[PDB]
Amino acid sequence: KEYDLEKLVNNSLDLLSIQRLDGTVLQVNPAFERLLGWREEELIGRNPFHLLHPEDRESTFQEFKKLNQGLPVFAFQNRFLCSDGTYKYFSWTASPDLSAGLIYVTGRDI
Amino acid sequence: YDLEKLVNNSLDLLSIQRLDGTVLQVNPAFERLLGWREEELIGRNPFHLLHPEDRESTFQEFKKLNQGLPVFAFQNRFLCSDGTYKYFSWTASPDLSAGLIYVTGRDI
């Protein structure tokens, strides 16, 4: 089963990610490399808020508080730094799992 | 599993089909975007919901999948439960050995 689901997630053009409640990235699909230019290994195991545009920090952290309170987030927009040194806009939809301590993230470039 | 929770909580359409088109698995996003319940899609070919003008192009893509070639950001219209056609962008990866196609979709 886990093989099939892996092929499903990895063949999405949209960003699919699993984070911890504190922000630590556990999983990313190849779409991140395609859209942001960063390799998987450079993102996994670390918090991504350092690629977050300074102006978008306050709003993004407020959304992360909501996730930590067990509220979903729909079509939230912020900017992430890409490997070419430019900021690109993304629309995020995030679903929290408090028992597992995870957040399930879907992202679209805009 | 964790990946299952990712698939089932995703805004994107995620589906597994057979090479002949028969739908084996569908995530809740299909119900959300197309209005159809899982039970009424599983086990069935979805080309019925395919807009007539998009049939020829979609079947050409399915031939490519059957030749083992992936398909990226292919756009067609599917009929929804409210009786309207909605636009989708599909990305499909074939697995000839398993006899499956991994389909990922986004509403346009």
Numbering used by the authors:
A (entry chain A): 7 to 116
B (entry chain C): 9 to 116
Please, what does the article write about this entry?
Amongst the structures solved at the beamline, the lowest sulfur content was found in the PAS domain of the protein codified by the locus tag LIC_11128 from Leptospira interrogans serovar Copenhageni Fiocruz L1-130. The domain contains only one sulfur in 116 amino acids (0.9% sulfur content), nevertheless the substructure solution was straightforward in SHELXD22 with 360° of data, a resolution of 2.5 Å, completeness of 83% and an overall multiplicity of 11.
Native-SAD uses light atoms naturally occurring in proteins or bound to proteins. We demonstrate that long-wavelength native-SAD has become a very compelling technique, where a low multiplicity dataset from a single crystal can be sufficient for successful structure determination, making it a general vehicle of choice for experimental phasing.
